[PDB]
Structures are given as C-alpha cells and as structure tokens.
Amino acid sequence: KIEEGKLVIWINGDKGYNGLAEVGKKFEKDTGIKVTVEHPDKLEEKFPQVAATGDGPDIIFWAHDRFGGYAQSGLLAEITPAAAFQDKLYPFTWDAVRYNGKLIAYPIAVEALSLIYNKDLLPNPPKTWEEIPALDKELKAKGKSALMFNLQEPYFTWPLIAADGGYAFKYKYDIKDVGVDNAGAKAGLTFLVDLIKNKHMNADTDYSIAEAAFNKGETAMTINGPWAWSNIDTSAVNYGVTVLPTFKGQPSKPFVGVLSAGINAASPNKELAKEFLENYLLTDEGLEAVNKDKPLGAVALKSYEEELAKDPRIAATMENAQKGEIMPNIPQMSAFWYAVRTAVINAASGRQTVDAALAAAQTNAAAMASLPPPDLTPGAVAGVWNASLGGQSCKIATPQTKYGQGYRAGPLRCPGELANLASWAVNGKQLVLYDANGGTVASLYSSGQGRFDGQTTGGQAVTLSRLEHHH
C-alpha cells in the first residue's frame, strides 16, 4: 500500500521536479512530513494500474483531461477547498478539474495555442482571419507566405472551427450533444477550406512543415503552443506571440489544457496532500520554485500569473486560454478526435464537402460516444521486434522515445533497406518506418496480437514479431 505519514508525488520528467522537491522540503521542515518527488516513465498509464489496486503515489500531476476518466473511475479523492482559497485561482481553471459537479484536482498551470508571428516580416499582425487572404497576396509577391500551421490535427484547426459556434460536447458533459455540424462549425471549416481553395494554405501542411517554414523565415505567421517557443529561440527569428485572430468578430476558441494535481483516492495522507498543495505549492514562492527549475507557462494562481504575465508570450497564452474552450475531461473525447480528424482532412482534400464531412463526423462521434469499446497507438508499437524478410531475419528497436514528431528507432544487424532505420511513427492503422532523412523505409499494419505485416518501400516483404520472455 501507500505508506502513511509520507507524501509521494509523481510528475512528468519534462517538469521542474527539483523545484517541486524544494517546496517538498519546506513542507518537511514545518511538519516533519517527508515529500518524495518521482518522475516515472509513462506515469499517466502506470497510475491507473496501481491506484486501482490500492497503491501508487499520493499526488499525481497530469493534464486535466485524463483526470475525468480517473474520477469517473473513482481513482481520485474529492477535494473541498475553501471558497477563500478557490478565489486565488482563475475561475475557469476550476472548471477544468470538475467532474460531475465535484472538484477532483487542484489546477496548476494553463496551456493553449496562440498566434506566433515574425515581427521582421510582419510588425503588426492581423486581428482578424478575414485579413489573411490580402496579407497573403502581399507576402507571396515577396516570396513568403502569410501563415502556415498543422492542418492535419483537429487540435490546431479547432480554434477557427469553434470560433462561431462549434463545440465538442455541451456542458456535466452531455455525450449525446455534439456540436460539430452546427452553423458556426460549418462556417469556420468552410472558411478554412476556401483558404486552401484560394491558394493561401496547402491542404497537406503538417506540424513539421509549418514549424520548419516559420523558423526558416519562409512564412510570417504560425499557430502553436509554448512547447514550441524553444525551437524558435534556436531560430534567432525575432518572433512575437499574440492573441489568435477573430473570425466573424468571435475569438478563436482553442482547447485549453490545465496541468493539475490529483490526490490518490487510496492515499492515507489525503489531508496532508491537501495542505501541501494549498498552503505550499499554490503560493507565489512554491510556484516560483518549480518555475525557476522549469517554466510552467501561464499559471492558475492569479497573483503569480500577474508576475509571469510581464512576459507577453505568457500573457498571450493566458488570454487565448480564457477565450478558448476547456478540453473536456471525458474518455468519449477520443470519438470526437477520430470523427473530426477524418472530416477536416476529407473536407480540405476536396474528397467531401464541409456539409457532408461535418454531418458524417457528428453522426460517427455521437454514435461512438454512446457505445462501449480505432487507430494504432504508440504504446502498441513500443518495444523490440523480430523482423522476417526473405530467408533473412533480424531485430529492430522502436522505443517510445520521442524524436521529432516521431520516435527513435534502431536496426540490429538488419540486411536490405532496414539497415537505414532511424525513426518510427503511427498513422491511424499504419506503422511507418523512416530513414535518417525522413524517407519512408516501410509501411506495416497490425495483423494480430503483437504482430505486424507490411512491405518495405521497395517491395520486399516484412513481418514484425515481438520479443518477450517469461520468468
């Protein structure tokens, strides 16, 4: 079990855990309660496994949207902070940590997309989406483009679609009220597609093409989150970050992710955990300790957010967050993503109309949400694989170690084209193996439990079979 009298905290490795440990020691000095801070591998999926068996950390830090499945799965303690304490965090951040009208976590930090522009190419960026066609003709005359952003993931195209009325589920979330083909969503997506029809954007621009274009000075604007600011400091491109453009006078509504701190329902230290988070972490000094270790971005605590907002990039993030739509914390969100990604791709590729793509998307999303359980997941690929080809055979490694928009991969005495394996990724139902130059080496599909079948980019058959042992 979880051990009484001590606090165990899990937080991801890309966070200021040493700063969090600092706050933990200040808490150990005033109370004698020891605070151990850990950053396990794949913590967001170890936690449900251990908490369901009465073990795990006392506190877990993760994005709010996963906590609704935890709370629906009764793996989280209900928190009841005083009204006086709730007033210190932005009111919308408490909405992100609400499930069935109960508070299930403490909001910590806040994240949302924002308009990123090149101040040299574009000193004063547009306030409206309507201005972007004219701005694009001006810039392409001079060999640049006005705007490029990932058109492949609904997360990036949703702020415009939802600007005039689109929404995932109505909000208590009603999984049978999907707002995907109302008038506002049709209008946003139609405007998006006509931008592509009128040759201001390319239907197949994805995350890397857009990021490369902006950092190489080829386009004046992009759309991304704080996670991408670091690669634009390598750029020496002088960029600003600002509010998203408005559509039909309505703000772009990006999805909002809220870093939150949940309490293990099996923890015998619930009250100790509430005191640490309320009285020690969620203070100007506590947040500063984590932030000096590793920046949080915008934060839910008003007082310290007023200090961080002196950075205009963080003020812009927070402003776009307060105008966006909180990412719904329900597992039925996976049906929203699947249906909407199909619809935006089909509408932008001309394979469907926005009225037909969105109509299908709302039918498929509503039906799948109402149903007990689509694409291939990087968890199902992570590991080491036997690789049969001809009479030849060998092994490849495909760790879930991020690398670009894919993952590191490695061949182990592999003949033929597999000797060039360097990265891997998943595309719906398809596993794709890549060069060190981004070229495609192979394409495979899950053909069963721990088994892949496909072919190289040059015709040779490939079969992947998992390595695994027994005690």
Type and span of the H or E element at 33: none
User: Pairing mode, if any, of strands 6-10 and 59-63?
Assistant: parallel
Record the tokens describing residue 283, joined without a space.
Answer: 């203070």
Q: Which of 381, 394, 386 is nearest to 468 (CA)?
A: 386
Distance in angstroms (rounded) separating the CA atoms of residues 150 and 157: 8
DSSP annotation of 256 = E
Owner of token pair 């701190």 = 261
What is the 3-state composition of the chain as percent helix, strand, coil, each rounded to the nearest 5? 35, 25, 35
Angle at 446 between CA 445 and CA 450, to 5 degrees: 145
The full DSSP string for 409-424 is -EEES--GGGGG--EE
Distance in angstroms (rounded) separating the CA atoms of residues 257 and 237: 27
Beta carbons of 292 and 20 less than 8 angstroms apart? no
Q: How far is CA 293 from CA 37, 63, 146, in A?
A: 14, 19, 36
Owner of token pair 């130059």 = 437
Beta carbons of 109 and 259 less than 8 angstroms apart? yes
Distance in angstroms (rounded) separating the CA atoms of residues 10 and 261: 9
Distance in angstroms (rounded) separating the CA atoms of residues 97 and 455: 46
Beta carbons of 208 and 371 less than 8 angstroms apart? no
Q: How many CA atoms lie within 13 A of 386 on its CB side?
A: 10
Distance in angstroms (rounded) separating the CA atoms of residues 239 and 382: 37
**Which backbone phi and psi does 274 adopt, to 5 degrees?**
-60, -40
Q: How many CA atoms lie within 13 A of 375 on its CB side?
A: 15
The full DSSP string for 107-139 is EEEEE--EEEEETTT-SS--SBGGGHHHHHHHH
Q: How was this structure determined?
A: X-ray
The residue length of the chain stands at: 471
Is residue 235 exposed (0-12), middle (13-18) or buried (19+ Cβ within 10 Å)?
middle
Beta carbons of 244 and 252 less than 8 angstroms apart? yes
Distance in angstroms (rounded) separating the CA atoms of residues 169 and 347: 21
Distance in angstroms (rounded) separating the CA atoms of residues 420 and 439: 10
Q: What is the resolution of this structure in A?
A: 2.5
Beta carbons of 291 and 15 less than 8 angstroms apart? no
Task: Give me the long-range contacts of 169-174 (CB less than 8 A, separation at least 24).
Answer: 169/328, 169/330, 169/332, 169/333, 169/336, 169/369, 171/328, 172/100, 172/101, 173/328, 173/330, 173/332
DSSP annotation of 89 = B
Beta carbons of 466 and 398 less than 8 angstroms apart? no
In the chain, the amino acid numbered 366 is: A
Angle between helices 333-348 and 354-369 (to 10 degrees): 160
Q: How far is CA 150 from CA 200, 206, 209, 244, 326, in A?
A: 14, 4, 8, 15, 20
Type and span of the H or E element at 404: none
* N-to-C CA span, the chain: 24
Task: Give me the long-range contacts of 165-170 (CB less than 8 A, separation at least 24).
Answer: 167/325, 168/325, 168/328, 168/333, 168/336, 169/328, 169/330, 169/332, 169/333, 169/336, 169/369
Beta carbons of 337 and 328 less than 8 angstroms apart? no
The full DSSP string for 144-213 is -EEE----SSHHHHHHHHGGGT-EEEE---EEEEEESSSHHHHHHHHHHHHHHHTTSS-TT--HHHHHHH
Q: How many CA atoms lie within 13 A of 48 on its CB side?
A: 13
**Which backbone phi and psi does 259 adopt, to 5 degrees?**
-60, 125
Q: Which of 85, 35, 71, 18 is nearest to 329 (CA)?
A: 71
Distance in angstroms (rounded) separating the CA atoms of residues 226 and 212: 16
Helices and strands per DSSP (H, E), number in the chain: 15, 27
Q: Which of 327, 337, 311, 375 is nearest to 107 (CA)?
A: 327
Record the tokens describing residue 292, joined without a space.
Answer: 């000096």
| Range 378-466: architecture per CATH | Beta Barrel (2.40)
DSSP annotation of 391 = S
Q: Which of 381, 391, 407, 400 is nearest to 464 (CA)?
A: 381
In the chain, the amino acid numbered 434 is: Y
Owner of token pair 């949302």 = 112
Distance in angstroms (rounded) separating the CA atoms of residues 369 and 179: 13
Beta carbons of 49 and 19 less than 8 angstroms apart? no
